[PDB]
Amino acid sequence: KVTVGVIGSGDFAKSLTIRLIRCGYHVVIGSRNPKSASESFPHVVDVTHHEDALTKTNIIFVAIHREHYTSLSDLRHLLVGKILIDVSNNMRINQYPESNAEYLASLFPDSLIVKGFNVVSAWALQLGPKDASRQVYICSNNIQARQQVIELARQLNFIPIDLGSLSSAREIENLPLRL
Numbered sequence: 204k205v206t207v208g209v210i211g212s213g214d215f216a217k218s219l220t221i222r223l224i225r226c227g228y229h230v231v232i233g234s235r236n237p238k239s240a241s242e243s244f245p246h247v248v249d250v251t252h253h254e255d256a257l258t259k260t261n262i263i264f265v266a267i268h269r270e271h272y273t274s275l276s277d278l279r280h281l282l283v284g285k286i287l288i289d290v291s292n293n294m295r296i297n298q299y300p301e302s303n304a305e306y307l308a309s310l311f312p313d314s315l316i317v318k319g320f321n322v323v324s325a326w327a328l329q330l331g332p333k334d335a336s337r338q339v340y341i342c343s344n345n346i347q348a349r350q351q352v353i354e355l356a357r358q359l360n361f362i363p364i365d366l367g368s369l370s371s372a373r374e375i376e377n378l379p380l381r382l
């Protein structure tokens with residue numbers, strides 16, 4: 204089984220882990236408190252500290268909020284070359300001078316940041332997307348990473364919508380707030 208990483212242990216991380224297992228992946232979780240977080244996950248999930256989880260995969264969902272990204276800054280060297288999937292949303296349209304994915308890319312300039320899955324609810328990861336809204340919008344400045352995340356979306360039974368460069372991340376982040 205291919206191993207996919209998730210940083211965080213909240214509702215989104217738990218729901219993502221469900222879907223990843225159901226679709227045939229092995230999951231490693233990086234948590235600040237893995238002994239505590241371990242009960243929030245099945246025994247088949249490897250719950251560990253961030254620095255250990257990162258050695259077990261090259262593709263990591265960053266299932267934390269933007270305001271906590273700098274808590275990972277000391278991992279910069281270990282994260283070099285890894286795909287970081289920015290799943291985040293904000294509470295306001297155009298909240299910051301940069302999109303959350305561009306902010307994450309500025310913190311980890313030698314990682315490969317891909318925006319994706321922010322439009323998917325936790326409940327949708329558990330039950331599946333509605334048949335008329337299976338779409339997940341994906342973008343990145345790195346074409347190869349973008350295509351890997353597009354393929355992961357397909358394996359998770361979503362319809363990936365390729366919006367090209369990371370410049371698209373801002374309006375992808377605005378979309379849940381628009382109607």
Ligand SMILES: NC(=O)C1=CN([C@@H]2O[C@H](COP(=O)(O)OP(=O)(O)OC[C@H]3O[C@@H](n4cnc5c(N)ncnc54)[C@H](OP(=O)(O)O)[C@@H]3O)[C@@H](O)[C@H]2O)C=CC1
Binds near residue numbers: 235240322
């Ligand atoms: N909930 C949802 O339905 C959706 C959420 N999202 C996005 O997913 C991401 C997570 O959302 P959600 O699960 O609801 O968020 P939570 O508020 O549950 O936070 C998630 C994780 O953040 C981690 N973390 C929390 N604080 C810190 C910190 N101070 N430093 C380092 N890590 C920290 C915790 O992991 P730990 O304690 O294990 O370290 C925690 O389990 C967000 O970006 C959100 O916008 C996207 C679509 C839907």
